[PDB]
Amino acid sequence: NYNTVSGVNGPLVILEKVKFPRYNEIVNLTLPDGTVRQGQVLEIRGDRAIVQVFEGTSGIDVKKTTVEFTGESLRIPVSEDMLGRIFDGSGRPIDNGPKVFAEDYLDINGSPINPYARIYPEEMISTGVSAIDTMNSIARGQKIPIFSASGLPHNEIAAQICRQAGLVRPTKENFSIVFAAMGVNLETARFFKQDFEENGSLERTSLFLNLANDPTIERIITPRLALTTAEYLAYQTERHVLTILTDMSSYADALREVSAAREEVPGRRGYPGYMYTDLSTIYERAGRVEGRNGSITQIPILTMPNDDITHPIPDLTGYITEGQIFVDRQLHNKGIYPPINVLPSLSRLMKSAIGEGMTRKDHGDVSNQLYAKYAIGKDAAAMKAVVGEEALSIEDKLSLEFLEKFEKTFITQGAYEDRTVFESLDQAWSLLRIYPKEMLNRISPKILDEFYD
Amino acid sequence: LTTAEYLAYQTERHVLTILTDMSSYADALREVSAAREEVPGRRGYPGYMYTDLSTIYERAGRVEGRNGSITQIPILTMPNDDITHPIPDLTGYITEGQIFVDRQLHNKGIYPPINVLPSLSRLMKSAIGEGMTRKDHGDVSNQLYAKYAIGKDAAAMKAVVGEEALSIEDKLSLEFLEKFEKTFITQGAYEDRTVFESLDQAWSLLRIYPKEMLNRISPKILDEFYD
Amino acid sequence: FPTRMTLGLMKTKLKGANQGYSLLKRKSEALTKRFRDITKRIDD
Amino acid sequence: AAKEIDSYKIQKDKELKEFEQKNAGGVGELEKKAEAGVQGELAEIKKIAEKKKDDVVKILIETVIKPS
Amino acid sequence: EYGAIYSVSGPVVIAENMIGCAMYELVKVGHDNLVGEVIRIDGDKATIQVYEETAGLTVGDPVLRTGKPLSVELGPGLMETIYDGIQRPLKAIKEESQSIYIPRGIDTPALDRTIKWQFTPGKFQVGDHISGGDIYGSVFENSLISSHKILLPPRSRGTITWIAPAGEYTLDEKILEVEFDGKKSDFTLYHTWPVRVPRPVTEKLSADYPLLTGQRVLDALFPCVQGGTTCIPGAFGCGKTVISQSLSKYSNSDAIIYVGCGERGNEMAEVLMEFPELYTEMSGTKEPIMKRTTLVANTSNMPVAAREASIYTGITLAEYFRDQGKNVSMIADSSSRWAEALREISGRLGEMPADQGFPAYLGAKLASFYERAGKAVALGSPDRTGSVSIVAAVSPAGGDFSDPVTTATLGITQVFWGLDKKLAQRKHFPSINTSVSYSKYTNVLNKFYDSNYPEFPVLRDRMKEILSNAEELEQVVQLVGKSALSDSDKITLDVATLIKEDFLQQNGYSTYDAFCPIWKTFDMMRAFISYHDEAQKAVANGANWSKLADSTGDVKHAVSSSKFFEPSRGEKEVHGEFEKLLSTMQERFAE
Amino acid sequence: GNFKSKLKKAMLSQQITKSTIANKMRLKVLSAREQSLDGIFEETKEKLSGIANNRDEYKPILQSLIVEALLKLLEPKAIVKALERDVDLIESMKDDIMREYGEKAQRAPLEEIVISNDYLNKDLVSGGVVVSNASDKIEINNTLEERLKLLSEEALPAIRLELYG
Helix, strand or coil: CECCECEECCCCEEECCCCCCCCCEEEEEECCCCCEEEEEEEEEECCEEEEEECCCCCCCCCCCCEEEEEEEECCEEECCCCCCCEEECCCCECCCCCCCCCCEEECCCCCCCCCCCEECCECCCCCCCCHHHHHCCCCECCECCEEEECCCCHHHHHHHHHHHHHHHHHHCCCCEEEEEEEEECHHHHHHHHHHHHHHCHHHCCEEEEEECCCCHHHHHHHHHHHHHHHHHHHHCCCCCEEEEEECHHHHHHHHHHHHHHCCCCECHHHCECCHHHHHHHHHCCCEEECCCCCEEEEEECEEEHHHCCCCHHHHHHHHHCCEEEEECCCCCCCCCCCCECCCCCEECCCCCCCCCCCCCCCHHHHHHHHHHHHHHHHHHHHHHHHCCCCCCCHHHHHHHHHHHHHHHHHCCCCCCCCCCHHHHHHHHHHHHCCCCCCCCCCCCHHHHHHHCC | CHHHHHHHHHCCCCEEEEECCHHHHHHHHHHHHHCCCCCCCCCCCCCCHHHHHHCCHHHCECCCCCCCCEEEEECCCCHHHCCCCHHHHHHHHHCCCCCCCCHHHHCCCCCCCCCCCCCCCCHHHCCCCCCCCCCCHHHHHHHHHHHHHHHHHHHHHHCCCCCCCCCHHHHHHHHHHHHHHHHHCCCCCCCCCCHHHHHHHHHHHHCCCCCCCCCCCCHHHHHHHCC | CCCHHHHHHHHHHHHHHHHHHHHHHHHHHHHHHHHHHHHHHHHC | CHHHHHHHHHHHHHHHHHHHHHHHHHHHHHHHHHHHHHHHHHHHHHHHHHHHHHHHHHHHHHHHCCCC | CCEEEEEEECCEEEEECCCCCCCCCEEEECCCCEEEEEEEEECCEEEEEECCCCCCCCCCCEEEECCCCCEEEECCCCCCCEECCCCCCHHHHHHHCCCCCCCCCCCCCCCCCCCCEEEECCCCCCCCEECCCCEEEEECCCCCCCCEEEECCCCCCEEEEEECCCEEECCCCCCEEEEECCEEEEECCCEEEECCCCCCEEEECCCCCECCCCCHHHHHCCCCECCCEEEEECCCCCCHHHHHHHHHHCCCCCEEEEEECCCCHHHHHHHHHHCCCCECCCCCCCCECCCCEEEECCCCCCCCHHHHCHHHHHHHHHHHHHCCCCEEEEEEECHHHHHHHHHHHHHHHCCCCCCCCCCCCHHHHHHHHHCCCEEEEECCCCCCEEEEEEEEEECCCCCCCCCHHHHHHHHHCCEECCCCHHHHCCCCCCCCCCCCCEECCHHHHHHHHCCCCCCCHHHHHHHHHHHHHHHHHHHHHCCCCCCCCCHHHHHHHHHHHHHHHHHCCCCCCCCCCCCCCHHHHHHHHHHHHHHHHHHHHHHCCCCCHHHHHHHCHHHHHHHHHHHCCCCHHHCHHHHHHHHHHHHHHHHHCCC | CHHHHHHHHHHHHHHHHHHHHHHHHHHHHHHHHHHHHHHHHHHHHHHHHHHCCCHHHHHHHHHHHHHHHHHCCCCCEEEEEEECCCHHHHHHCHHHHHHHHHHHCCCCCCCEEEECCCCECCCCCCCCEEEEECCCCEEEECCHHHHHHHHHHHHHHHHHHHHCC
């Protein structure tokens, strides 16, 4: 324990008379007021060391402060008792329970899956949503994000997804998920809490809650703890691990804040240059392990700033994660059920859960045909809104009515309403019947004769 | 500023401040800020410039218990004929209202080219009325502004389909606009007109239009004015 | 491509297109009224 | 037609109240058994507390000379 | 350790022997003891940033450090006192110094220590276990609200020994002696709490308690519950001051905390002059509105540190009043000035800007300020319930919503009510855009209002859909024509015009139209819905639109008078009129 | 329909009450297990308190701990803080401590050992030592309570792995 400190500038700390410091090492900071704040080591040069304070450097004496260095790297108290119990962003229990007994102490940074040991996404799952089935399939163990906008029903959609996940999946051992929030709103926290309570999955799931009132360091460290927890659940516990993370934008802005506070060289849009790799850290952690049962399925949730799909956040998210589910504000003001844009939203591998032997061979072709009819309907909608209603051909109006029906019926179901995959395929088969016989060029003759009543 | 302050709080007298070329003072303050070798902000300007202007325009106002009042009317030239300049944006939200200049009217060989559209004052409500200037001030002001605006729209319309499509209120607004531009707007370099003469000229110029041509005027005022 | 001058030209073209849109709108209204009166006159 | 409707409504209300009563009874019984299960778990945890009391004696004895 | 400045660069001054001082700590620089704030600390020499003029400060002048951060004094004597961004009285400065200007380096107390108050122990005796937030007594401050509860200051837990209550004492006198684990300790009626640290509470809760705006449209369309957060435009000349004053006066909250950032001198002077003119309407007439409220005013000439942190101090005071278990409200005018001051502070801190000249901590500070409000239970034995209703105004430079301040305001605040200058130029009541109005608090507010079976939500959503249909009908009216529509469209248009006149428009100048009661608004919406339903039923009954409009004119004239006639004690008088509307239906079933 | 909605709401309240009761049961189980762990820690603390009651056995342990602390110091002059009861014992062991320090590291001889006049509280500290440098910038905790509390982190997992499998 070193009581020696030299300088203080902004939200950081620098100490001397120390040696052999470890990168991102756990360090206990005892202030003059008796306040104990946890911190991590930043860099070490010669006999001098520099670290960043999580709780802030506000109200701390230079010569009256003591510091204890563990020397070990970042360590989290992972266990099998975390299920059903809620934890905060700092690791402390938010459930007001007693001391949690750690089964194992492991680095929250997480270990990248070896390429040869990495197994490809397989099987399938039922999300209860038609768009999460027909338009864009969701594999079990794969990783896909969700792009929403501020003011939109992102929390409601996430709640519906989390509630209908394990419910619909059984129609394909219950599915276990993990809830994680970093620097989010108290209202959204209450909504998410009521959502997890209503879903009743809170007993079989774990929760990491980092309030916006709390520091940025804790919020950024919450994702690491959740990653280590999900990893321990998908490896040591050998169970199916679903990853639900929210408010990534706050963590991003906080990351940019930390990058700017250290006067580091910023990347695009004032963000960090390592931001891509920083996101890719927890992005590439998802996948399947050969020889090991269970898998970690990443279902992140982010909000594009000012409803801009061209924002660096969404760009880097797509550059990190493979595939995403976009939520447009255009259909959010329509009053219809949750606004998923079929065009922008896509899955990395939709061909893995398709074909015969899994569900049906009529899935993929119908998806391509429906996407084609929808896109053609959109272009025809633009043309109709441009020139006029009498300036458009028959196929234009047909695809327009087909897309409108697809939005009003197929796209609009409900939050508490979980549509079965069979119901989705049936509704899609009924949706294709609205279009003409020569309308869909992406469909085969056999499937066309089979689906048409 | 100190000179105006000494003649206000101490000497207790009415004072008026006028600043010319605030942009040159902005470049001067930029050099002064660069003298400290500080890293400049957007477009090479200090981030504390807002406070610098806040330490300037705040020297004007009325003091409670003091008869003497100090008023300030600064002036700044917009760079490259653009209102997007940081200076204008700084004085915009700070000061109340702004007096712009139309380069077209200045190139039209006329008197001072202050665009009535852009010209506005937030304290203009307290500078008019009975006991201040006149009860016919604000109403005729808004009516004249409306006449100039609608006259401009009618000017654009007449430049499209021609003067044969000119309507009643359209032609009236056209004549009113041309007149106000060639009479009301034009004053002079050394020319100084009284508020009474201004209101009289306003009513005389508005006399070209009928009694029902002004919807911005009140019945009592119109009855107590027109004669 | 991304220059202040290009932004100025684009903005000027935008404003001109706006004024032109208003003018074309009013002209469309006048033409509509004229064609309506001429239509009633055509029926008569 | 009105009497049968009111009778069916009264029957539905009675069935609803019966459902709420069943829920109350079930909740009571479950809450009654939960304490017993927790008691037994506390007993097993007590035996484990004795075994780990001996184990704590050994662990402390081992941790005493640890300071080398 | 006493500091000595070894360097002076502009407003910034670095002083050696400052090792005793800490980071982000206030300090008195020079012999004039000018107000300053410590930015960084290097060894024994700390770098401090003076918020005042650095002129007059020389070398050799001893610099005294406060030894702590920026704080404020919560307790008696705080109410009915105007303050600045530095929390100092202007009126007392004009009374003492007898000058129209404020000298650099001058300092004055926030609460008057020369004011004697009569205090008495309410629910605290000797030997009882108490903690921080627990009321140790009550002292009467204002002439309106009940005696201000003096509570045991934070981080203090122990048994009371010697109580100086009851009796007459000032704010500088210790009214109690508490015995903690640290043995003997002293406690007074006045306390000091950090401006950057929100007031401690027992438990956090969600706010189901609706706050009365007094306005019809405000309570109907975009209702803000007590503890809730709402935002609006900062456009000048749009009549925002009237809406703000009316909201503050008709509020159901106990106290009101107004914290300004910066603005023109004329506006600040107008607000300051119109502030004390307001009178209460609870117990007939108590004291002025300034007595049960707190005001913090900072002009453009004020420091940036006294601007961006002014909201923190105001929220600290509001939470301090909320720590006594009373519902309060925090009003913020021109927050964009505080944002620009935060940008200048970012430039002064050397922090690299993020976007459009915004700081790195922008979103964090905004979220921190937005999370300070809400309804909760304060700490201490008292266990009193309280709330803080956040209200902010944004006045962007360019007016674009793409600005960081606008996005942060819309993001943090769950309720956003736009103010359109054209709507105020429409010769109508207070300006609000019906199209851009939205709130996410509608659900909880509806579920909570259903307890008293006062349900706006049904009629609210109905009138919303009706407004949408009327909007489409308006778009069609500007497309084809108003005479080409059907009977339902015409009835919808007439109902839309009627709702925008006798319903949405409420004159704050009148007596009965100033504050619209919950029962009044509910009965108004009910009568309107009854009229619309009667018209829709008569439309399907085979009755002509002209004959109906001619016969039902009396019903419209009677319904138009439902905004007046004062007190709603006989609200049933309106219900009869609704029955008359049904008779109007019977009149449509005859002719 | 309304009756079905109300019944669904009541059943939802019943399921919520059941989930809350289950959460209370799980919390009770966790609190019981934590009470068992804290009980084992209490018995271990009792055994540690009983082991600290023997001066003859703790003497050599104190010497070895002081030597190990000095090995983690390697400072020319070492300041040591100890309990009032261990003051005389450490004072008499000063020569033995210097000899043991010289034997441990011959590349870094011990010039002087300064004994602090401030003794640890008898109630707060039941035993152990406190090592520090001449400048008192860095300090190592040889205290028994601190050592046990710090060891408990990695010990809990091992003890649980042994006892619970």
